[PDB]
Amino acid sequence: TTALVCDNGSGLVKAGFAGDDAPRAVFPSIVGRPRHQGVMVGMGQKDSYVGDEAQSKRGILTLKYPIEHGIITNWDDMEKIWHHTFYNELRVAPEEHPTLLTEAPLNPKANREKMTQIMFETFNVPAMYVAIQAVLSLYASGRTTGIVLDSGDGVTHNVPIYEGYALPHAIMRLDLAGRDLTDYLMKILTERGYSFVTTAEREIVRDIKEKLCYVALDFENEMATAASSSSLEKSYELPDGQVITIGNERFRCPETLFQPSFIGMESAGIHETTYNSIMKCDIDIRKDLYANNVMSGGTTMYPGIADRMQKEITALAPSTMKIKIIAPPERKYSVWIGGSILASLSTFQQMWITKQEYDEAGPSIVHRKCF
């Protein structure tokens, strides 16, 4: 019975049932359309490949995301993905379960609103709830206090929570995220002749990133050692068997998370952003935040990113403050896990917005909150 938990992210979709210890359906939020000789109808063929299908057929498809920086732009393709989950991956009659959805804070109200509408009308959902991803991530850690740094492909955001009592006043959001890192790699790999321009090629670059990139603890001295050939130089085999050799880029791309100016992102680096949000809060809180820096999301899966982070924050902070980062394994699922927790939680059941309530109240109901 129970409910569904759906991490409808900007990168990919993680869906499963509340109470599960992991998602059952994990696939990319991509819809692919035929590039050459536009479509054939009565043969079936197909012109809308989704997720792993799009991956399989990738070479001849135009890969589009529906989501841009946390915003659902292409609601039609979004709908297709929802359908694909419910009927192809989980294969369960939507209307039999409540649906827990998640989102990044500070989204345009229209996203929460219209998305809700669709769930109720198109999919006949019985009840649903929308939660902030960072909050859920904290639940997964089991801490009641800390800063949650959650970062994916569309956005990066920071939420500070103190023994419950989340502090809305200091929530921050950056457009700097995984897709920018990927784009930077396209630009940087160009230095060595490795031109990538199509959406299929973008995907390949992503694969590279996720396997070879790492965070240097000292980018300047990393670059210094990079003057000599070493373990930095690492091969990668393409889909067609050709081999790529990557050097400085292994960490120069991750560097942009601390040196955002590289891509024209005139803003603070992550470590600065974090530090600043601490400064924005009451001095009596700061201490506990320093010792409870929760990190989650796929873009925190770079080797040594936590260590680099700790180092940098320690430098910014007063020497007497203990800087400690909470960054368990399975950070990719942190949000989903948090969702499973709350959905299984007894108290939480009062939160469900039923379709009945929606119909009686209307759209605005999605912004309510109480526990």
Ligand X SMILES: Nc1ncnc2c1ncn2[C@@H]1O[C@H](COP(=O)(O)OP(=O)(O)O)[C@@H](O)[C@H]1O
Ligand Y SMILES: C/C1=C\CC[C@H](C)OC(=O)C[C@H](c2ccc(O)cc2)NC(=O)[C@@H](Cc2c[nH]c3ccccc23)N(C)C(=O)[C@H](CCCCN)NC(=O)[C@@H](C)C1
Q: Which residues bind ligand Y (CB under 6 A)?
A: 69, 71, 108, 110, 175, 190, 193-197, 201, 242, 283
Per CB under 8 A, which region of 15-23, 206-214, 280-288, 355-363 contacts its own copies? 280-288
The binder of its own copies chosen from 1, 21, 41, 229 (CB under 8 A): 41
Minimum Å distance from CB 251 to ligand X?
12
The two structure tokens encoding residue 125: 């959902």
The two structure tokens encoding residue 301: 């899966």
CB 64 within 8 A of CB 78: no
Size of the site for its own copies (CB under 8 A): 71
Judged by beta carbon distances under 5 to 8 A according to partner kind, the member of Mg ion, ligand X, ligand Y, none in contact with residue 19 is none
Minimum Å distance from CB 350 to its own copies?
7
Judged by beta carbon distances under 5 to 8 A according to partner kind, the member of ligand Y, Mg ion, its own copies, none in contact with residue 86 is none
Per CB under 6 A, which region of 140-148, 150-158, 232-240, 345-353 contacts ligand X? 150-158
Q: What are phi and psi of 250, to 5 degrees?
A: -50, -35
Integer Cα distance of 272 and 138 in angstroms: 21
What pairing do the DSSP bridges indicate for beta strands 353-354 and 145-151?
unpaired
Query: Residue 327 in 3-state DSSP?
Result: coil
Integer Cα distance of 176 and 143 in angstroms: 26
The binder of its own copies chosen from 21, 76, 220, 237 (CB under 8 A): 237
The binder of its own copies chosen from 35, 87, 117, 124 (CB under 8 A): 35
The binder of ligand X chosen from 51, 178, 269, 339 (CB under 6 A): 178
Q: Is 23 among the residues that bind ligand X (CB under 6 A)? A: no
Minimum Å distance from CB 188 to ligand X?
15
Q: Is 191 among the residues that bind its own copies (CB under 8 A)? A: yes
Nearest CA to 101 among 76, 125, 132, 122?
A: 132
Which positions ≥6 away from 72 have C-beta within 8 Å? 66, 78, 111, 114, 115
Q: Is 103 among the residues that bind ligand X (CB under 6 A)? A: no
Distance of CA 325 to the CA centre of its chain: 19
Integer Cα distance of 353 and 345 in angstroms: 16
Q: What are phi and psi of 282, to 5 degrees?
A: -60, 140
Q: Is 282 among the residues that bind its own copies (CB under 8 A)? A: yes
Backbone conformation region of residue 113, classed left if phi is above 0, alpha if psi is from -120 to 50, else beta: alpha
- Give the CA dihedral 306, 204, 248, 314, nearest 10 degrees: -10
Which positions ≥6 away from 2 have C-beta within 8 Å? 17, 18, 19, 97, 343, 344
- The residue sitting closest to ligand Y, measured at its beta carbon, is 193
Minimum Å distance from CB 38 to ligand X?
29
- Restricted to residues 208-247, the positions that interact with ligand X (CB under 6 A) are 210
Q: Is 299 among the residues that bind ligand X (CB under 6 A)? A: yes
Integer Cα distance of 332 and 301 in angstroms: 8
Judged by beta carbon distances under 5 to 8 A according to partner kind, the member of ligand X, its own copies, ligand Y, none in contact with residue 263 is its own copies
CB 360 within 8 A of CB 158: no
Minimum Å distance from CB 152 to ligand X?
3
The binder of ligand X chosen from 298, 308, 310, 325 (CB under 6 A): 298
Per CB under 8 A, which region of 57-65, 86-94, 121-129, 134-142 contacts its own copies? 57-65
Q: Which residues pair with 50 in a beta bridge?
A: 31
Query: Residue 219 in 3-state DSSP?
Result: helix
Integer Cα distance of 337 and 14 in angstroms: 10
Minimum Å distance from CB 250 to ligand X?
12
The binder of its own copies chosen from 22, 40, 93, 224 (CB under 8 A): 40
The binder of its own copies chosen from 22, 93, 106, 224 (CB under 8 A): 106
Pick between residue 50 and residue 127 the one whose CB is nearest to ligand X.
Answer: 50
Q: Is 281 among the residues that bind its own copies (CB under 8 A)? A: yes
Nearest CA to 347 among 58, 139, 152?
A: 139
The binder of ligand X chosen from 49, 184, 302, 358 (CB under 6 A): 302
The binder of its own copies chosen from 95, 121, 163, 307 (CB under 8 A): 163
